[PDB]
Amino acid sequence: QNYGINLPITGSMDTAYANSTQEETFLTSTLCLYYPTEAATEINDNSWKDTLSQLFLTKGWPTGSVYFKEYTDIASFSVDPQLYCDYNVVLMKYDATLQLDMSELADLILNEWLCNPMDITLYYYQQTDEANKWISMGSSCTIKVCPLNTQTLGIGCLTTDTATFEEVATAEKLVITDVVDGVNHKLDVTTATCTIRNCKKLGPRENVAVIQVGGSDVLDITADPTTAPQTERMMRINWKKWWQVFYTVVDYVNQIIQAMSKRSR
Amino acid sequence: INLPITGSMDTAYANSTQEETFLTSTLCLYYPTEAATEINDNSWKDTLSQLFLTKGWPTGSVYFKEYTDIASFSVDPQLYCDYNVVLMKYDATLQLDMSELADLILNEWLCNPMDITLYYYQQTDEANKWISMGSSCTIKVCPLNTQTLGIGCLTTDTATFEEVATAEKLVITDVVDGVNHKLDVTTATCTIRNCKKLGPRENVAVIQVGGSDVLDITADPTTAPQTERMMRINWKKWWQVFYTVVDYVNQIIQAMSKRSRSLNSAAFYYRI
Amino acid sequence: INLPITGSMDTAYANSTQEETFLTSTLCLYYPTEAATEINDNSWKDTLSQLFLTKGWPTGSVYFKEYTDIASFSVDPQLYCDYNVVLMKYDATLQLDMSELADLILNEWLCNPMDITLYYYQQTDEANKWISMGSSCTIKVCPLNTQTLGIGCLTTDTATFEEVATAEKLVITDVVDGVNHKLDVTTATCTIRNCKKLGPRENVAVIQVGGSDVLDITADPTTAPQTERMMRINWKKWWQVFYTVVDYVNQIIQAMSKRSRSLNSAAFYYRI
Amino acid sequence: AQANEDIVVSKTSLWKEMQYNRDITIRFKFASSIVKSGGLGYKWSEISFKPANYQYTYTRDGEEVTAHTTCSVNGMNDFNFNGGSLPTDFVISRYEVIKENSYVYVDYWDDSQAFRNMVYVRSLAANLNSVICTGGDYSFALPVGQWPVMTGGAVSLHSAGVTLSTQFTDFVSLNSLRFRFRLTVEEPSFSITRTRVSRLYGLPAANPNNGKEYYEVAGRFSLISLVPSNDDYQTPITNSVTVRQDL
Amino acid sequence: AQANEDIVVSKTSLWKEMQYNRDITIRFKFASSIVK
Ligand SMILES: *[C@@H]1O[C@H](CO)[C@@H](O)[C@H](O)[C@H]1NC(C)=O
Ligand SMILES: *[C@@H]1O[C@H](CO)[C@@H](O)[C@H](O)[C@H]1NC(C)=O
Ligand SMILES: *[C@@H]1O[C@H](CO)[C@@H](O)[C@H](O)[C@H]1NC(C)=O
Ligand SMILES: [Ca+2]
Ligand SMILES: [Ca+2]
Ligand SMILES: [Ca+2]
Ligand SMILES: [Ca+2]
Ligand SMILES: [Ca+2]
Ligand SMILES: [Ca+2]
Ligand SMILES: [Ca+2]
Ligand SMILES: [Ca+2]
Ligand SMILES: [Ca+2]
């Protein structure tokens, strides 16, 4: 029962394959879908949640285990996502004008960040490793940054004249900023409307699952432009309706939750 | 981890982890607007940062977070730092409020939601309480007998219920464990949650700036404890308070210990 | 004495030094004006002496010393006796003042003078403090940087200084140890001294006549101790207070112990 | 640390980097130039500022310190008032006023050790307190008629950046410390009485001192200069000027 | 070798001998004094 400590666990290879945890993890766990308003709009029904839950029942998920949580748009959901369940699925629409928005959303929810606060007015920050980034949320974020030199002076910018600063964000609801590691940056941010946090990316969050309903795979989670991965919980679909999408999610929920693993934290 | 740990008594006392935890950690004060007012300066934060710098805490590790009222802070307190200090004024008329705040931030809670209309809930153990947050909560409860009828109340008449809160921003409700209660809450302004009290949060340190010790963290009327990250100052100004916190921050952090459970910004975990 | 002492656990317990330490020692009470006012008698001192005579203290060994108020006593106290008892009225509007009085008399201080005009001072360790006495002490401080200029304050514009005291008779001030502070004091009306806190003064005994225990001698917020010679009473008259003291004077002086440091009539030693 | 410290942060054989941290009492003074056009006496040519020297001697903590200060103004605004083209109307071709867009320079020098051989300075910084400069009453002495009086004007000087400068004079030349001041317009306004002008902020350039001997402001300065290790070296101070022989 | 170089031909504890070789554009102007 030792917490906070990491110890070596032993094993063997002659032990037998224990029974299936499926059909019991369903009963003792909860699932939560995050669907857009477009879907309920197309549906135009007030009993579709009860219908989907009665269907889930056949796959073993009981009545009071499945939940639906609506969001109007990708950015409105990007603003402080609270994914608090034992299993989370997120349906996500594809739009070329929102590729970066729905890559940042993925980068934020699929991964488990350790976020410390930030005080722009006083301190000038820097990123130490390739996992330290600045995530800003809110209704309209507008971020500008000036690198600084060894003697606390600017580089192509003036510490006083905010206009000289370099604009990385322009009225975005969620921004994940990675700047050059090793140089102290002075920031200007619309702190009245947005909160910015220095966040270190830890290991991933295996509790969520993004499902891109439309176009091809675009999500460049990794800031480094070399990996361009595609995890197991990054799914894709082709759609001309939404009832088909929901029936598919239901009929293949078992593979989804086999691709998802409950958190460590 | 479930495995055991082993050790010895011949092994040597390693060096002081102070002067490195200061570099690799963050400190965050929670001060009242009264202090900013009495100070009437627009650089005291930088002042305290430059002061802490001599104690070892670097520049970008110290943070200050204004909270206007104890109750406004009690409304979903968001602590996301590695070492949190809270400066808490003393008011007899707010004794239970600033005790519930302590009971909530000092200890670690695991919370499920509550659906009052559809279901009827009970408490199982002496740590399963009902914590309600919001801007104005007015809670009433009817205990129920074995056969789902009322006891001193009626299942329909919300006036027969027993009031336990009257426009309280944060309430921690402990009712009899073993019986089912039907609740009535101002759900439009407040959210109530069935929470279990886990082991303590060693990341936070309360500092009662004023009067005598009043905080009874534990709901049972037998312990009346006083933990280590729960201090008391006597005050007439605020700069003296801050200079004191600074000069004695090392004792504070020696009285505190980084968490074990997980990374979280809220004062309570959510598990549905 | 650098030398050691030796002993044994087989030797015998000597007779009671009580009933002789009384004879060869003096006792002194410090009562407020309020007591004599509520009493309205002119022979209560001789009465209490005749009562003490039963407890063993002879006639010319007890003494009483009036003090109009806690602060008027805090202004350069002078305890020159062999066993001092102080009766202290509780008031939340005077908590820090009657804690500073405690911190001053219960403890034993080694004080040097301070020249603010010609010098800028700093506290070395967690036992160095600045104690200031007089009729109205207004103390402001500007911390300084490596190049002897201001940090969140202007080294000349005294309005930009940071106010730690406002018209106080006795102030005990602790600032961030390791930085130089420029001071502003009402030197016309108050003297300030840089004082180090040595071992405690076992000659005096504070008795809080009213409210719960609040005195925090230690300026650090973590300890908040309660010594043996810091007593509390609940009261509705003063004759009962004095009869209780006279009836339980043996316990008080068993909780007290004669001094070892030196012979001195002030509340602080002077070493220039 | 003393209020008048002197420390050594580096010392080679002949030279040494000496740090100085000292309190000062800047007592300065404006000075106005009044040029009156010819004719009858109803037209004034210029009412402007002139850089003004003022040497004094004040008391330090048991020491007497002689000083030398020099006040100047930069970026002043040039107003004017012309009420008629005839020789009998009161006109002022150009008079100077001070507002936000202007700055007030004050060169300062002492007989102390800090300014004995100061030619190089780094780590310069100072804590100065703000003061209020109020103008006085200048009576335009017209030949005949009424006597308009330019009366009023208040403006608050606030601390600003610090630099070096050189105070040149017909007697001494001083490698001096230049304190800047910015201006925030105050409530007392200046108005020419018996005239159609009033309620305009700034300070007038006719009688800025307001019959005062000086404007006092206390400060502290902290620098690091290059001084020869031997404390006997001297840099030329006095002058004997013969400039502008053509003039 | 650049056009606007900056070299250090020696260096002592505090001082240093530096060499500077730089291009310049002298944009000068006369001024006349008339007296009638
Ligand atoms: C595991 O599966 C086998 C085959 O279905 C079954 O016989 C066995 O009882 C299961 N184990 C347990 C503990 O029920
Ligand atoms: C441990 O502390 C001792 C005593 O200060 C010191 O000599 C030694 O270098 C330290 N070792 C480490 C690894 O910090
Ligand atoms: C101590 O007390 C005992 C018991 O009264 C007595 O007999 C003895 O004489 C006393 N000691 C002295 C030194 O008188
Ligand atoms: Ca975005
Ligand atoms: Ca730029
Ligand atoms: Ca980076
Ligand atoms: Ca409450
Ligand atoms: Ca009832
Ligand atoms: Ca209970
Ligand atoms: Ca006091
Ligand atoms: Ca200040
Ligand atoms: Ca101290």
Q: What is the rounded distance in angstroms from the CA atom of residue B205 to the CA atom of residue B202? A: 8
H helix and E strand count, chain B: 6, 13
Give Cβ neighbours of residue D31 (< 8 Å, ≥ 6 apart). D49, D50, D51, D52, D71
State the distance from the centre of ligand 9 to the C-alpha of B88, rounded, in angstroms: 27
Residue to mutate among B89, B236, B253, with most C CBs inside 10 A, is B236
Nearest to D98 by CA among D224, D212, D208: D208
Phi, psi of A251, rounded to the nearest 5 degrees: -55, -25
A-chain residues near B271 (CB < 8 A): 84, 86
Q: Do chains D and B touch (3 or more CB pairs under 8 A)?
A: no
Instruction: Let me know: does C103 contact C174? Beta carbons within 8 Å.
Output: no
Give Cβ neighbours of residue C46 (< 8 Å, ≥ 6 apart). none
Query: The tokens 């005062």 sit on which residue?
Result: D212
Instruction: Let me know: does D59 contact D102? Beta carbons within 8 Å.
Output: no
Q: Kindly list the protein residues that place their beta carbon closer than 5 angstroms to ligand 9, a single-atom ion.
A: B 123, 174, 177
Q: Point out residues after which chain D has a gap (C–N over 2.5 Å).
A: none
- For C46-61, b where at least 16 C-beta lie within 10 A, e where not — what string? eebbebbeebebeeeb
Give Cβ neighbours of residue D66 (< 8 Å, ≥ 6 apart). D55, D56, D57, D110, D111
What is chain C's Cα-based Rg?
A: 21
Q: In the numeric block, which tokens belong to residue C98?
A: 């009657």
Ligand minimally distant from the alpha carbon of residue A170: 4
SS3 call for C229: coil
Query: The tokens 């103004």 sit on which residue?
Result: D73
- Residue contact E15–D10, C-beta within 8 A: no
SS3 call for B215: coil
D-chain residues near C180 (CB < 8 A): 1
Q: Which of E12, E14, E33 sits opposite D17 (nearest CB)?
A: E14
Give Cβ neighbours of residue B160 (< 8 Å, ≥ 6 apart). B142, B150, B152, B153, B154
- Alpha carbon dihedral A160, A165, A167, A168, in 10-degree steps, equals -100
Q: What is the rounded distance in angstroms from the CA atom of residue D30 to the CA atom of residue D213? A: 10
The dihedral through the CA atoms of C233, C237, C240, C241 has a sign that is positive
Q: In the numeric block, which tokens belong to residue A100?
A: 């970066």
Which 102-121 residues of chain C touch chain D by CB within 8 A? 117-120
Q: Which of C118, C154, C157 sits opposite D3 (nearest CB)?
A: C118
C158 to chain D: nearest residue by CA?
A: D129
Q: How far apart are the first and last CA of chain A?
A: 15
Distances (CA, A) of C200 to C27, C82, C171, E14: 19, 15, 19, 54
- Residue contact B59–A123, C-beta within 8 A: yes
Q: What is the rounded distance in angstroms from the CA atom of residue C249 to the CA atom of residue C89? A: 19
The dihedral through the CA atoms of A208, A213, A217, A218 has a sign that is negative
Q: In the numeric block, which tokens belong to residue A153?
A: 């002076």
C157 to chain D: nearest residue by CA?
A: D129
SS3 call for A115: strand
Q: Which of C143, C165, C219 sits opposite B47 (nearest CB)?
A: C143
State the distance from the centre of ligand 11 to the C-alpha of C136, rounded, in angstroms: 22
Q: What is the rounded distance in angstroms from the CA atom of residue A242 to the CA atom of residue A40? A: 9
Q: Give the method of determination.
A: cryo-EM
> HSE of A48 in the Cβ direction (CA atoms, 13 Å)?
16
Q: What is the rounded distance in angstroms from the CA atom of residue D180 to the CA atom of residue D128? A: 10
- Residue contact B237–C213, C-beta within 8 A: no
- Residue contact D128–C156, C-beta within 8 A: yes
Residues at the binding site of A for Ca(2+) are 45, 127, 156, 164, 166, 178-179, 181, 251
Q: What is the rounded distance in angstroms from the CA atom of residue C82 to the CA atom of residue D5? A: 47
Q: What is the rounded distance in angstroms from the CA atom of residue A61 to the CA atom of residue A70? A: 20
Q: In the numeric block, which tokens belong to residue B27?
A: 């400190």
Burial of D181 (0-12, 13-18, 19+ CB in 10 A): buried
Q: What is the rounded distance in angstroms from the CA atom of residue C115 to the CA atom of residue C130? A: 12
Instruction: Let me know: does D103 contact D74? Beta carbons within 8 Å.
Output: yes
Ligand minimally distant from the alpha carbon of residue C172: 10
Q: What is the rounded distance in angstroms from the CA atom of residue B25 to the CA atom of residue B3? A: 28
- Residue contact D125–C148, C-beta within 8 A: no
DSSP single-letter state for residue B192: E
Q: What is the rounded distance in angstroms from the CA atom of residue E17 to the CA atom of residue C240? A: 90
> HSE of C161 in the Cβ direction (CA atoms, 13 Å)?
19
Distances (CA, A) of D77 to D74, D99, D100, D202, D209: 9, 8, 10, 10, 19
Residue to mutate among B237, B244, B245, B250, with most C CBs inside 10 A, is B237
Q: Which of C153, C179, C213 sits opposite B51 (nearest CB)?
A: C179
Instruction: Let me know: does B47 contact C143? Beta carbons within 8 Å.
Output: yes
Give Cβ neighbours of residue A249 (< 8 Å, ≥ 6 apart). A33, A89, A91, A211, A256
SS3 call for E31: coil
State the distance from the centre of ligand 4 to the C-alpha of A147, rounded, in angstroms: 22
Phi, psi of D158, rounded to the nearest 5 degrees: -115, 145
Measured from the Cβ of residue A20, the count of other Cβ atoms closer than 10 Å reads 8
Resolution rounded to one decimal, in angstroms = 8.0
Instruction: Let me know: does D41 contact D65? Beta carbons within 8 Å.
Output: no
State the distance from the centre of ligand 2 to the C-alpha of C36, rounded, in angstroms: 63
Instruction: Let me know: does C233 contact C35? Beta carbons within 8 Å.
Output: no
Pairing type for strands A172-177 and A132-141 reads antiparallel
A-chain residues near B4 (CB < 8 A): 2
